Design an enzyme around this catalytic site. Structure first.
Site, PDB file in Angstrom:
ATOM      1  N   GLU A 262      -7.626  12.962 -10.453  1.00 50.98           N
ATOM      2  CA  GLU A 262      -8.260  12.128 -11.489  1.00 50.98           C
ATOM      3  C   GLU A 262      -9.725  11.910 -11.110  1.00 50.98           C
ATOM      4  OE1 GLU A 262      -6.443   8.420 -12.970  1.00 50.98           O
ATOM      5  OE2 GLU A 262      -4.465   9.162 -12.374  1.00 50.98           O
TER       6      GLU A 262
ATOM      7  N   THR B 115      -0.385  12.766  -6.830  1.00 56.58           N
ATOM      8  CA  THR B 115      -1.337  13.246  -5.849  1.00 56.58           C
ATOM      9  C   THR B 115      -0.768  12.971  -4.462  1.00 56.58           C
ATOM     10  OG1 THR B 115      -3.181  12.746  -7.364  1.00 56.58           O
ATOM     11  CG2 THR B 115      -3.751  13.043  -5.021  1.00 56.58           C
TER      12      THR B 115
ATOM     13  N   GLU C  54      -1.367   6.153  22.148  1.00 54.15           N
ATOM     14  CA  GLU C  54      -0.496   5.153  22.745  1.00 54.15           C
ATOM     15  C   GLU C  54       0.567   4.714  21.753  1.00 54.15           C
ATOM     16  OE1 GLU C  54      -2.723   2.187  25.126  1.00 54.15           O
ATOM     17  OE2 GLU C  54      -4.145   3.797  25.585  1.00 54.15           O
TER      18      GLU C  54
HETATM   19  N1  LIG Z   1      -1.747  -1.268  -2.863  1.00 52.37           N
HETATM   20  C1  LIG Z   1      -1.928  -0.565  -4.000  1.00 52.37           C
HETATM   21  N2  LIG Z   1      -0.935   0.260  -4.434  1.00 52.37           N
HETATM   22  C2  LIG Z   1      -1.083   0.987  -5.564  1.00 52.37           C
HETATM   23  C3  LIG Z   1      -2.334   0.865  -6.312  1.00 52.37           C
HETATM   24  N3  LIG Z   1      -2.241   1.666  -7.374  1.00 52.37           N
HETATM   25  C4  LIG Z   1      -1.036   2.263  -7.321  1.00 52.37           C
HETATM   26  N4  LIG Z   1      -0.348   1.848  -6.249  1.00 52.37           N
HETATM   27  C5  LIG Z   1       1.000   2.338  -5.910  1.00 52.37           C
HETATM   28  O1  LIG Z   1       1.001   3.765  -5.849  1.00 52.37           O
HETATM   29  C6  LIG Z   1       2.152   4.300  -6.512  1.00 52.37           C
HETATM   30  C7  LIG Z   1       1.666   5.128  -7.699  1.00 52.37           C
HETATM   31  O2  LIG Z   1       0.799   6.140  -7.169  1.00 52.37           O
HETATM   32  P1  LIG Z   1      -0.775   6.362  -7.501  1.00 52.37           P
HETATM   33  O3  LIG Z   1      -1.510   6.380  -6.176  1.00 52.37           O
HETATM   34  O4  LIG Z   1      -1.241   5.455  -8.614  1.00 52.37           O
HETATM   35  O5  LIG Z   1      -0.724   7.852  -8.102  1.00 52.37           O
HETATM   36  P2  LIG Z   1      -1.825   8.939  -7.692  1.00 52.37           P
HETATM   37  O6  LIG Z   1      -1.733   9.175  -6.209  1.00 52.37           O
HETATM   38  O7  LIG Z   1      -3.164   8.540  -8.267  1.00 52.37           O
HETATM   39  O8  LIG Z   1      -1.266  10.278  -8.388  1.00 52.37           O
HETATM   40  P3  LIG Z   1      -1.492  10.658  -9.932  1.00 52.37           P
HETATM   41  O9  LIG Z   1      -2.085   9.449 -10.620  1.00 52.37           O
HETATM   42  O10 LIG Z   1      -0.081  10.958 -10.368  1.00 52.37           O
HETATM   43  O11 LIG Z   1      -2.401  11.863  -9.869  1.00 52.37           O
HETATM   44  C8  LIG Z   1       3.021   3.097  -6.893  1.00 52.37           C
HETATM   45  O12 LIG Z   1       3.982   2.870  -5.859  1.00 52.37           O
HETATM   46  C9  LIG Z   1       2.017   1.958  -6.975  1.00 52.37           C
HETATM   47  O13 LIG Z   1       2.565   0.657  -6.736  1.00 52.37           O
HETATM   48  C10 LIG Z   1      -3.359  -0.049  -5.778  1.00 52.37           C
HETATM   49  O14 LIG Z   1      -4.445  -0.197  -6.371  1.00 52.37           O
HETATM   50  N5  LIG Z   1      -3.095  -0.710  -4.650  1.00 52.37           N
HETATM   51 MG   LIG Z   2      -3.880   8.667  -9.851  1.00 46.86          MG
END
Ligand SMILES: Nc1nc2c(ncn2[C@@H]2O[C@H](COP(=O)(O)OP(=O)(O)OP(=O)(O)O)[C@@H](O)[C@H]2O)c(=O)[nH]1
Ligand SMILES: [Mg+2]
Ligand SMILES: CC(=O)O[C@H]1C(=O)[C@@]2(C)[C@H]([C@H](OC(=O)c3ccccc3)[C@]3(O)C[C@H](OC(=O)[C@H](O)[C@@H](NC(=O)c4ccccc4)c4ccccc4)C(C)=C1C3(C)C)[C@]1(OC(C)=O)CO[C@@H]1C[C@@H]2O
Ligand SMILES: CC(=O)O[C@H]1C(=O)[C@@]2(C)[C@H]([C@H](OC(=O)c3ccccc3)[C@]3(O)C[C@H](OC(=O)[C@H](O)[C@@H](NC(=O)c4ccccc4)c4ccccc4)C(C)=C1C3(C)C)[C@]1(OC(C)=O)CO[C@@H]1C[C@@H]2O
Ligand SMILES: Nc1nc2c(ncn2[C@@H]2O[C@H](COP(=O)(O)OP(=O)(O)OP(=O)(O)O)[C@@H](O)[C@H]2O)c(=O)[nH]1
Ligand SMILES: Nc1nc2c(ncn2[C@@H]2O[C@H](COP(=O)(O)OP(=O)(O)O)[C@@H](O)[C@H]2O)c(=O)[nH]1
Ligand SMILES: Nc1nc2c(ncn2[C@@H]2O[C@H](COP(=O)(O)OP(=O)(O)O)[C@@H](O)[C@H]2O)c(=O)[nH]1
Ligand SMILES: [Mg+2]
Lengths: 426, 426, 426, 426
Positions: free
Chosen positions: B60, B134, B243
């Site tokens: 993205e 991702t 460690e």
């Molecule tokens: N701590 C935290 N967790 C997040 C956030 N956004 C998404 N998540 C978690 O990440 C997971 C969803 O994955 P994302 O990282 O949004 O997806 P991505 O890796 O961008 O992959 P695509 O969007 O499918 O290309 C879920 O378990 C969410 O709760 C954030 O801003 N903070």
């Molecule tokens: Mg994403």
């Protein structure tokens, strides 16, 4: 004559060693610029034992600082007395040790060791008459344990006729500080039994107890604990560096404290040990000092001496005192507590005396005990190790560096033999 | 020096990374520009600027576009910030097979370049999610590539676990399992949280009525900082990434720590409270204060590490540990009696303006491996089974190079892992 | 030679003891800083009997302060002479005693006693020649009664050839101060009969009477009452610490006052006792002093001596006086009141003399009577105890700590036997 | 040190507690903030603040909401102040069974945490009412839990008794009996008042024409302070909570003291009056000045404790006691002749600005167990019978887990208690 080469390996060893140097520099009137500003000719007479002189009345510890990562030594450098060390005496890597004896002994340590050995050789060549080597380590880490063991082995191969002594900080079974601690300790001791003439065994638990009970210290700093160790260390070699009524060589101490080749693990102690407040209720007699020294609360190893017997004890007293008084007092102690003194040795103790107190005391003393009780410490480590080994826990980190089950088994066998020997001479 | 590399992959990871970088900047004294062991996370330019030893990836563009217009923008050097064309679409099979095998090479090259700055490359940090498209496949691919390249080097994963009850995605269960299949045989250590626990913590300890991503991310950042500071800063009893590997990986497959950070205290609740070391330790070991949905009473802690910060005394810590050991409720594994590593840093944690937390003189990060976590794994497996029984939402995956037996194999692996955990518990 | 070890146990005992030390310090020219500022060499000659010397002419009571709660000892510390005591000589708990002999003797006291014994041992070892032990308690509380009794037992086991004397504050039947008083007293006395060589029996009623009638004190303070006791105590051991015409050892006094092993409960008295106003109507003759001493109003136990007979009387006079005059006067007293002097003993009294007055008096005297009349006190306590026992009142507090009816019965039997013995030698 | 914990449960208890805390603050010198043996009731923070060693519970939010907006607000640390959702509804069966078994755990945890501050945890204080819904069942539950946890620790109940004539609630009689059923076999000591007596006192001795809750509460607070000050402050003849247990609990079931505080004197009536010690004592023993509807002539005092404060002399007190004993009207129990404990504190009581009482140099708190109180119990039983005969207002209780036989059992227990009292009297 009789000059000593100092080595600090691993983090513990390095930090303790810094304090040791600080103490001794103060003792000999050496300021952080390497200049002498003392008031006595006795202060310089035997300065050779720890220091080399350079142009412009500069004095330099015959000290080597070794580490597999830079941070510790950088901190040392930044410190007050850090700038006294000759910069070429810092020998260090960048790849970490992972609390892993294998990394220290076999792999990353092996890469650095030759360079260390060359510096050792130069120091040896600069000696009028080399007495021996003093090392500072931990038992439970990777650098002090693995690298330290390695270094000792190589030095004994090269200087097999010289004194090899270590101040080794050991695990305390009630409060473990690392997860692989038993592995690291057992692997180290397996080689220390063979390749050292004496090892002074300190456990932090005992130090904490000392701090709390006697010094009235609610909040011990590692600095203060290191000070305690440093004082012991200084005490041990006082009679190499100063006059006396009855004098003690390092070799002579070994001879007096070692009835059998393997049994050279000592509990150090010190006196006086009181607070700033509980001193005015006391006077400073030889009796008082001896009482302090034989108090369990003033031991720096994790044992009750009453759970065993002393095979041999060496006391080194500093300050002006009657030999008659000292001997008599020790005889009284022997008489009254004869059950804690093995009956094979008439005159269970050795006394040494230095006609020179450490600054700001009239009298001081340092205690070296060789007790059958210390077997308990070995037992605890062996048991801890053994359980984990039963499940081959954490083992892949070590097998991956080429170590084998048989070696581990050998180590355990050694430990058990040690304890059996102590039992035999109970 | 000992120096590090940062990788933030998938939206979530990137978001976390932003916060982390902000925290770092606040700590070492770096501006939004780069103006002013600081070099573990910041390489210097010709003058003025400092460059985060970092890499930012997402398919993205919108995520990293945001970064490129924010205040934290010209801190980063545009070599690092990589973007794709079409996103991963919550589909492992696009992240690993299709769009993964295209831009991964570029990222690898960048990583190599960055390494060619590190004299002492300690290791990496990877931030992702067991739950993004991702972050599930691409991450795995990257890990594999790194293993192929370096192997010996230290590797960490900060893994946002699927919360047992609360869903986010529809195919969170498949993705996670696929990640487990591939990452498990490469990454030596993974530090894990879930969001539910964090929300709970915010509600109870901080009295925050609105759970949102920024504050949550800040919490994680704090933990990260705590983990690092041993490399980034001074302190008696220091720690290396290696460690952790040595300490928290008994068997090579079991390497899934939980985390926790205390104190988690608001502006008011800091007062009406002393905040002692023992107290903090107790708080850390509390069932509710864990950062995952896992009751630590439902199993046994194998190996534990505790990273104390700021004004701390070792003796106090030891006492606290002893007290904890004494408590009969908090069970340990039979065969590992020494299940603690102590880490102490003279740097106290510093909190970001306009955030959740207040000043605390002393804090802890606690990292623990247990038999209790297995329940979560089991739950996940059950979930996977339930939706694999129908074979629903499978037409996304099959199209981008997949097989039916892979899933079965993954399930088998999970079962094996569970069995291993059970054995360990026994 | 002949050095004495001092112990204060329980609140009463501790507060009295503070005053005792204050008195004696003044007597020997010792100021609250532990420095000597006296005008006579006689003042230091035998200072060893109560004090140890430290560096810098510091003198320290060979005193042990024991309590199961901190408050009393804290108050002592805060007090004027409190800072003279060596801080390691405060041995104290935090869990309260509930006016419960069981808590003092069996449970909470048992936990602390060994630590006390160690300090006792050190003091014994520091003695050129240990004479004996002086204890201060109440009879009616938990600490002085239970803990005190315990301590005495252990010391007699360890030092069975030494003098054991107590100053024991007892109940006054007309004005009870606690509800379980009879229980505590009877349980204590049961063991004091067996394990002490002499007990000086003071009851506050008698002191109040003294204060009102002779001293003209409308408003007695506990401090003033303690002063009275202190003066007696000082008087008792004057001849150990000073010269004399005819001298008295502690042991010699015991020998002169104890015709049968069990009968060693004394009524102390003092002279002169007048106001600031009723002194100018008097001159200070040996006759006058003797008259005062044998006045019922100058007795410190709760008896009319005319309700019985004196078995033996010891008088210790201080100041320069004719032995002839003294003896003659005592003979006259014997002649005129022969019915109150048991006829088994020719020369019913012993006299001792110290050639040294207490500061600001020309002459003083201290009286020790062993009278069959004191049986009445024992009777009253036995009756009080007995009634409550008849209804098993308050008993659960003691049975809950393991004590049994049979033990209580034994105590009562002992008491009754005591009174029977007195009756026999009426 | 000896240190305490405070619990205020139900509206009434909370209200009392407010006043108590205010009084404490005024005494030790604490502000509304926490700014400035003080640690029995106030734990220190990092700096400035002091935190009341307290817990506040009510299922009505409105009570504790009031506290949270008052001047006394930021003195308290919001960890302590707990609130429910729906109130107890003057129904034991909601306080114990339904809403009780929900939030009790939280409170217990808080208590545990607080204890983990106390080195010397002496005991607790519980403030409630035999008459509230919260205070009747919830209190009992809490007591039970505490017993389960600690057992050995000291426990007190300040219990607002049902006034024989004056009703407040419709089911005050059931609630009280239920409380008695459960509390009786746990709480070792309970100190009790009723409102009617207090009102009477206000009318007569203070000339106050308007009986209201604030002034009444202040009176109770004063009593509480008097009870405590032995722990909180210095004084000859000191007292412990355990001492009360020992002193005022002859048989383990009978443990229901009355209380009283004199002087109860206005601004005018302090003048035209000397206020001697004996006078005060007499006032304390007056039929009308008791804090419950119970004629002390209609029975016998078993065990009495008197806690004198400020400028007091022991001799005077003794004289007063003697005088009281002499009076033939005030009967005592045959079998307990020693039925007095004397408590004397150099701290004089300090009264809250804008309140009932004036300055008094000397005051007493008198705590007494009698056969006369049994009448009140009998009355209560009669009341219970009268309304249990119809079985009215029973449909509230049955719905929240109850049985018919429970009531019968409670009645039987009450009867047994009455019988025991009668026996004691005999
Ligand atoms: N701590 C935290 N967790 C997040 C956030 N956004 C998404 N998540 C978690 O990440 C997971 C969803 O994955 P994302 O990282 O949004 O997806 P991505 O890796 O961008 O992959 P695509 O969007 O499918 O290309 C879920 O378990 C969410 O709760 C954030 O801003 N903070
Ligand atoms: Mg994403
Ligand atoms: C007024 C006075 O007499 O003060 C003493 C003192 O109070 C006491 C408590 C000192 C004090 O020591 C400690 O409190 C202490 C702190 C950390 C670690 C170990 C001890 C003292 O700090 C330590 C100091 O020691 C020395 O001066 C020795 O030479 C000692 N020096 C150092 O350790 C040292 C410290 C800082 C910088 C450089 C050196 C030494 C001992 C052996 C070998 C070489 C040197 C002394 C006597 C005192 C103080 C100053 C209060 C004691 O220690 C020593 C080592 O003497 C603790 O118990 C002894 C008894 C002493 O009486
Ligand atoms: C002008 C003058 O001669 O004053 C006398 C005095 O008036 C009288 C009344 C003193 C006075 O004593 C009391 O009033 C008293 C107060 C509390 C408890 C006991 C007594 C005197 O205070 C007490 C004081 O005693 C001493 O100095 C002794 O050495 C005594 N010391 C202490 O008790 C003492 C007091 C405070 C601080 C340190 C020590 C002593 C006795 C035995 C063993 C050791 C020391 C004396 C003679 C007097 C005064 C000053 C009025 C008397 O007491 C003593 C102990 O001598 C009370 O009856 C005697 C007779 C004395 O004549
Ligand atoms: N001294 C005093 N007594 C009170 C006060 N309020 C109520 N009481 C007494 O307490 C009893 C009623 O119990 P409460 O404490 O009001 O009831 P509660 O514990 O709040 O329980 P619920 O309101 O039923 O949840 C009666 O005997 C009242 O006289 C007060 O402010 N001061
Ligand atoms: N006295 C003292 N002991 C230490 C210090 N640092 C670590 N230790 C102890 O040394 C052991 C850990 O080994 P360490 O030297 O840190 O590992 P290394 O750096 O790999 O050699 C533990 O028992 C620690 O308690 C220190 O500065 N002073
Ligand atoms: N002379 C004197 N007698 C006291 C003092 N304090 C308490 N007493 C008496 O000692 C008895 C009570 O025992 P106490 O020592 O207070 O209980 P403990 O603290 O449990 O040993 C009662 O007879 C009190 O009158 C004091 O300071 N001086
Ligand atoms: Mg209410």
């Amino acid at each position: 004559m009789r000059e000593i080469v100092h080595i600090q390996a691993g983090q513990c060893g390095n930090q303790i060693g810094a304090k040791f140097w600080e103490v001794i520099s103060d003792e000999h009137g050496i300021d952080p610029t390497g200049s002498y500003h003392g008031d006595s000719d006795l202060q310089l007479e035997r300065i050779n034992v720890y220091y080399n002189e350079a142009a412009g009345n500069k004095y330099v510890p015959r000290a080597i600082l070794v580490d597999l990562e830079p941070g510790t030594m950088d901190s040392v450098r930044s410190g007050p007395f850090g700038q006294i060390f000759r910069p070429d005496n810092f020998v260090f890597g960048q790849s970490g040790a992972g609390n892993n004896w294998a990394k220290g002994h076999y792999t990353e340590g092996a890469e650095l060791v030759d360079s260390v050995l060359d510096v050792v050789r130069k120091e040896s060549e600069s000696c009028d008459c080399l007495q021996g080597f003093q090392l500072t380590h931990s038992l439970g880490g990777g650098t002090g344990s693995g690298m330290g063991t390695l270094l000792i082995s190589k030095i004994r191969e090269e200087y097999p006729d010289r004194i090899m002594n270590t101040f080794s900080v050991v695990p305390s079974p009630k409060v473990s500080d690392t997860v692989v601690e038993p592995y690291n300790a057992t692997l180290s001791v397996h080689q220390l039994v063979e390749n050292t003439d004496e090892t002074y065994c300190i456990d932090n638990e005992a130090l904490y107890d000392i701090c709390f009970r006697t010094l009235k210290l609610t909040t011990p700093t590692y600095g203060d604990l290191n000070h305690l160790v440093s004082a012991t260390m200084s005490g041990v070699t006082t009679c190499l560096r100063f006059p006396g009524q009855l004098n003690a060589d390092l070799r002579k101490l070994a001879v007096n404290m070692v009835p059998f080749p393997r049994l050279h693990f000592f509990m150090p102690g010190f006196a006086p040990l009181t607070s700033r407040g509980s001193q005015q209720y006391r006077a400073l007699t030889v009796p008082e000092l001896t009482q302090q020294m034989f108090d369990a609360k003033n031991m720096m190893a994790a044992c009750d001496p009453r759970h065993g017997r002393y095979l041999t004890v060496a006391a080194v007293f500093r300050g002006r005192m009657s030999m008659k008084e000292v001997d008599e007092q020790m005889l009284n102690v022997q008489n009254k507590n004869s059950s804690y003194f093995v009956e094979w040795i008439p005159n269970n103790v050795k006394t040494a005396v230095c006609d020179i107190p450490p600054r700001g005391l009239k009298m001081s003393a340092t205690f070296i005990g060789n007790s059958t009780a210390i077997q308990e410490l070995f037992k605890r480590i062996s048991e801890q190790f053994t359980a984990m080994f039963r499940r081959k826990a954490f083992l892949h980190w070590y097998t991956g560096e080429g170590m084998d089950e048989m070696e581990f088994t050998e180590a355990e066998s050694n430990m058990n033999d040690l304890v059996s020997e102590y039992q035999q001479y109970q | 020096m000992r120096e590090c590399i940062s990788i933030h992959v998938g939206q979530a990871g990137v978001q976390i990374g932003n916060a982390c970088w902000e925290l770092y900047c606040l700590e070492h004294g770096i501006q939004p520009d780069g103006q002013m062991s600081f070099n573990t996370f910041f390489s210097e330019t010709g003058a003025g600027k400092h460059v985060p030893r970092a890499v930012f990836v997402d398919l993205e563009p919108t995520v990293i576009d945001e970064v490129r217009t924010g205040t934290y923008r010209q801190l980063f050097h545009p070599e690092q910030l990589i973007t794709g064309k079409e996103d991963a679409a919550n589909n492992y099979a696009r992240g690993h097979y299709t769009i993964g095998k295209e831009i991964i090479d570029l990222v690898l090259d960048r990583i190599r370049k960055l390494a060619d700055q590190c004299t002492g490359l300690q290791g990496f940090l990877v931030f992702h999610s067991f739950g993004g498209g991702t972050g599930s496949g691409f991450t795995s691919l990257l890990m594999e590539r790194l293993s192929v390249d370096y192997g010996k080097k230290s590797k960490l994963e900060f893994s946002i676990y699927p919360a047992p009850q609360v869903s986010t995605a529809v195919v969170e269960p498949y993705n996670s399992i696929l990640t487990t299949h591939t990452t498990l045989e490469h990454s030596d250590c993974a530090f894990m949280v879930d969001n539910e626990a964090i929300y709970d913590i915010c509600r109870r300890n901080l009295d925050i009525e609105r759970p949102t991503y920024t504050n949550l991310n800040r919490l994680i950042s704090q933990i990260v900082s705590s983990i690092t500071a041993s490399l980034r800063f001074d302190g008696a009893l220091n720690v290396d990434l290696t460690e952790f590997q040595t300490n928290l990986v008994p068997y090579p497959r079991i390497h899934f720590p939980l985390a926790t950070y205390a104190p988690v205290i608001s502006a008011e609740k800091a007062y009406h409270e002393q905040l002692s070391v023992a107290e903090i330790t107790n708080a850390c070991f509390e069932p509710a204060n864990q950062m995952v949905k896992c009751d630590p009473r439902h199993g046994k802690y194998m190996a534990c590490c505790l990273l104390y910060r700021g004004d701390v005394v070792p003796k106090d810590v030891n006492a606290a540990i002893a007290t904890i050991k004494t408590k009969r409720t908090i069970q340990f594994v039979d065969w590992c009696p020494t299940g603690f590593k102590v880490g102490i840093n003279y740097q106290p944690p510093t909190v970001v303006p306009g955030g959740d937390l207040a000043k605390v003189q002393r804090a802890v990060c606690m990292l623990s491996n247990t038999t209790a976590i297995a329940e979560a794994w089991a739950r996940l497996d059950h979930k996977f089974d339930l939706m694999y029984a129908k074979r629903a939402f499978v037409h996304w995956y099959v199209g981008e190079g997949m097989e039916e037996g892979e899933f079965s194999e993954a399930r088998e692996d999970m079962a094996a892992l569970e069995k291993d955990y059970e054995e360990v518990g026994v």
